[PDB]
Amino acid sequence: QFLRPKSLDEFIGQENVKKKLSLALEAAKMRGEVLDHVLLAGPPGLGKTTLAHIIASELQTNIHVTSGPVLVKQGDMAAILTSLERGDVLFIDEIHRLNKAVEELLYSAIEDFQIDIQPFTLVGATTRSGLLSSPLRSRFGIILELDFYTVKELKEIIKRAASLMDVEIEDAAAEMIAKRSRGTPRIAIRLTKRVRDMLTVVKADRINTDIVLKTMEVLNIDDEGLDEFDRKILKTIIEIYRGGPVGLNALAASLGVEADTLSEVYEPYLLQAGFLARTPRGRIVTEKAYKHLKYEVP
Numbered sequence: 001q002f003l004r005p006k007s008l009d010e011f012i013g014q015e016n017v018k019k020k021l022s023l024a025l026e027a028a029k030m031r032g033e034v035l036d037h038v039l040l041a042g043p044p045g046l047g048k049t050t051l052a053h054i055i056a057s058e059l060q061t062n063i064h065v066t067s068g069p070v071l072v073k074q075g076d077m078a079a080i081l082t083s084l085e086r087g088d089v090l091f092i093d094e095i096h097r098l099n100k101a102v103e104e105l106l107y108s109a110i111e112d113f114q115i116d117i118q119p120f121t122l123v124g125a126t127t128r129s130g131l132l133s134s135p136l137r138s139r140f141g142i143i144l145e146l147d148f149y150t151v152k153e154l155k156e157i158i159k160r161a162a163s164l165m166d167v168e169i170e171d172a173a174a175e176m177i178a179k180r181s182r183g184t185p186r187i188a189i190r191l192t193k194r195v196r197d198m199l200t201v202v203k204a205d206r207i208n209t210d211i212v213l214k215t216m217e218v219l220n221i222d223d224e225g226l227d228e229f230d231r232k233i234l235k236t237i238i239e240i241y242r243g244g245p246v247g248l249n250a251l252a253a254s255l256g257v258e259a260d261t262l263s264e265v266y267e268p269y270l271l272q273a274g275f276l277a278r279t280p281r282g283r284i285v286t287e288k289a290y291k292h293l294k295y296e297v298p
């Protein structure tokens with residue numbers, strides 16, 4: 001947790017999100033008012049959880065962490081709501097996974113602020129804002145959509161991480177890791193830790209391009225940052241479905257994984273990076289995919 005930003009000033013990137021959040025945060029603090037409800041949406045590892053904690057820290061209130069699938073019976077939701085103190089942040093990750101039972105209960109605590117519930121700030125996190133119910137989504141006065149980070153931003157996050165792990169790194173090497181981080185801070189930091197391991201075993205004074213390449217080879221990460229499963233998705237569409245189009249459920253069944261893990265975790269960067277495309281009839285692979293994986297373009 002020593003690598004987790006403790007404030008917006010330590011949060012690299014997401015300029016648009018930061019200015020919007022900072023505005024609402026500073027104003028609330030100055031007026032001593034409870035912050036309006038906030039919804040954080042975007043792929044995993046982009047900092048949603050980090051922002052939820054920063055919000056509570058700046059308001060100088062307590063944060064209550066929970067998950068949608070964890071809150072099944074109304075009893076679990078009631079207990080949490082009644083433990084909230086004025087101004088507290090109720091952070092619900094995977095909020096779109098709330099069942100109608102606890103959902104309707106949470107919905108009520110937002111309007112009438114009674115189940116007697118102390119005014120609080122609801123901070124929800126989801127991979128896609130479109131997953132939340134129409135009713136609940138209209139309750140958030142602040143919606144922050146996080147998109148993938150730029151290579152420059154990731155490079156900065158990597159250099160910051162290395163410094164915190166007591167390891168030197170050359171700019172060129174940091175650039176190389178960032179280019180292979182699939183636009184995600186979580187991925188970039190994990191790769192940096194693994195490259196640190198290589199530097200340790202090879203007894204180097206600082207992380208260079210050579211050390212990075214050696215590590216990428218051990219981790220099976222290619223020049224585009226794609227890992228084994230990313231390649232598996234693309235290769236399955238290419239070989240089994242002749243390039244597509246193939247439906248999400250069909251592709252998921254062939255891969256032996258939940259459709260959610262596919263469309264919420266892996267597909268986002270593949271679409272953003274131009275390896276995959278979505279059509280009404282299903283997912284399709286692009287020419288860039290065939291060329292990158294060295295497949296004869298049909």
Ligand SMILES: Nc1ncnc2c1ncn2[C@@H]1O[C@H](COP(=O)(O)OP(=O)(O)O)[C@@H](O)[C@H]1O
Pocket residue numbers: 003004005010011012013014043044045046047048049050051125157185186189
């Ligand atoms: N802007 C950022 N600067 C530095 N590290 C970041 C940033 N955003 C995310 N991270 C890092 O990445 C990891 C992932 O973040 P997290 O907030 O848990 O993601 P999410 O809830 O979106 O899955 C955290 O370790 C965190 O400290």
Ligand SMILES: [Co+2]
Pocket residue numbers: 247248249
């Ligand atoms: Co479908």
